[PDB]
Amino acid sequence: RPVLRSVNSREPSQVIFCNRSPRVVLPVWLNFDGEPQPYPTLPPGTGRRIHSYRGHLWLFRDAGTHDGLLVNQTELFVPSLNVDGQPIFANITLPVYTLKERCLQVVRSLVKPENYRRLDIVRSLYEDLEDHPNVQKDLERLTQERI
Amino acid sequence: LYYMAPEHLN
Amino acid sequence: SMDVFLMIRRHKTTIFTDAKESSTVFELKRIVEGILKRPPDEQRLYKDDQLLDDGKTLGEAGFTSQTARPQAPATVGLAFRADDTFEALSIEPFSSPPELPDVMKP
Amino acid sequence: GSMYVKLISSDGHEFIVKREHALTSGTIKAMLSETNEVNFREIPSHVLSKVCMYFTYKVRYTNSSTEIPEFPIAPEIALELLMAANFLDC
Numbered sequence A: 001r002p003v004l005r006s007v008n009s010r011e012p013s014q015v016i017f018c019n020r021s022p023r024v025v026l027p028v029w030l031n032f033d034g035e036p037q038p039y040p041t042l043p044p045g046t047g048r049r050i051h052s053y054r055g056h057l058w059l060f061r062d063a064g065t066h067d068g069l070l071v072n073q074t075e076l077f078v079p080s081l082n083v084d085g086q087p088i089f090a091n092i093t094l095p096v097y098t099l100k101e102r103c104l105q106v107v108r109s110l111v112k113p114e115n116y117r118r119l120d121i122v123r124s125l126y127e128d129l130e131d132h133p134n135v136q137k138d139l140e141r142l143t144q145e146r147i
Numbered sequence B: 001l002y003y004m005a006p007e008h009l010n
Numbered sequence C: 001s002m003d004v005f006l007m008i009r010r011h012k013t014t015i016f017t018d019a020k021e022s023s024t025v026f027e028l029k030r031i032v033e034g035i036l037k038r039p040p041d042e043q044r045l046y047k048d049d050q051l052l053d054d055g056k057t058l059g060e061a062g063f064t065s066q067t068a069r070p071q072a073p074a075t076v077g078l079a080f081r082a083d084d085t086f087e088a089l090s091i092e093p094f095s096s097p098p099e100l101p102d103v104m105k106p
Numbered sequence D: 001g002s003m004y005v006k007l008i009s010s011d012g013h014e015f016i017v018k019r020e021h022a023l024t025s026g027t028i029k030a031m032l033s034e035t036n037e038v039n040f041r042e043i044p045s046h047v048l049s050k051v052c053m054y055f056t057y058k059v060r061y062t063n064s065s066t067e068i069p070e071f072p073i074a075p076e077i078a079l080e081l082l083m084a085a086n087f088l089d090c
Helices: A099-110 A113-118 A122-129 A135-147 C025-036 D024-031 D045-061 D075-088
Strands: A011-018 A023-031 A036-039 A045-051 A057-062 A086-091 C003-009 C015-020 C042-047 C074-082 D004-008 D013-020 D035-038
Touching: A011 A023, A036 A135, A057 A086, A057 A135, A099 A122, A099 D045, A099 D075, A113 A122, A122 D075, C003 C025, C003 D045, C015 C025, C015 D045, C025 C042, D013 D045, D024 D075, D045 D075
Parallel strands: A011 A086, C003 C074, C015 D013, D004 D035
Antiparallel strands: A011 A045, A023 A036, A023 A057, C003 C015, C042 C074, D004 D013
16 A cells, blocks of 8 residues: 555644745645545635644645645645644745756746747757656655655 | 545635 | 845956845955955946945945845946056946747747 | 856856855866866856856755745746756756
8 A cells, every 4th residue: 555645543633725935836635545636726825724634645736837846845744733722834835946947847838848849959858848747756756765 | 434535624 | 134145247257146235335345355356445336327335235225135136136336446547337248048939939 | 165166158258156156066066176267168148147046046045944936037048048957957
């Protein structure tokens, strides 16, 4: 059974998703079988109350492009015990992307995929452009790292 | 089995 | 909040550096001095075409956290003295990008 | 091993940046092992200036608890900046 998955704790944890990024954020919940399940998106600079649970796993992505985002400065978010009944913050931010990855984001936003190969670049960068960021590949990378 | 997924019930 | 990010430009030279909003023009000339080996009494610093007074803070001169950011640093013009006489401020422009490809026109 | 280093573009513009900042490029870090100038015959000044802004941005915001702003890249410079980033490995 998949390593990265929420546990069925049945222990409520009040959370507030706080989008501190300029992107439209897609919160993605890993269900009890490790399958990613999307929750409604958050406009930039907005926040939202969630009823989640102890030991559930979340990650967060640009809704339009699936660029990775950070939550409390890391890849994954796990709601904890509500200490003194106070909700937990999930602060969603931009990472410091590599200059390369950031250039790829901008070129992707301007060029339709059918036309990537009509740009005057070397072979390796076409591949790079085509290899869109992807939740499923991120989970496989995280699982491998966690072994 | 009694699965409770997160809600936007909030 | 406190830090301001600058490009000090003269001719074909561009220095990337930071300093505090509270620090002075003269203190900035000292920073230039360490890099370009010319004393403060042989520099003039400019915001646009305006010669900056040595005693003024950078924030007073219009460089602030809001305006002089890491990813979009503010330009400070530099001109040197030439034994007797100060040269005119002259900043050589950067190169021009090619015409945007049709495939990149939104 | 000086505090600052000089990066020169293909069109002759000189950029003086903190050594630490320049080391954000694996490529520049290799070239500096020990010299002080580094010549980039493939990178024009309008690209190399942006690369230096990226070095500032990276050093300022990596490992900050603060909100990070988007690194802006104008449409006109994207392709060339992408090639540069790929060569510089940053």
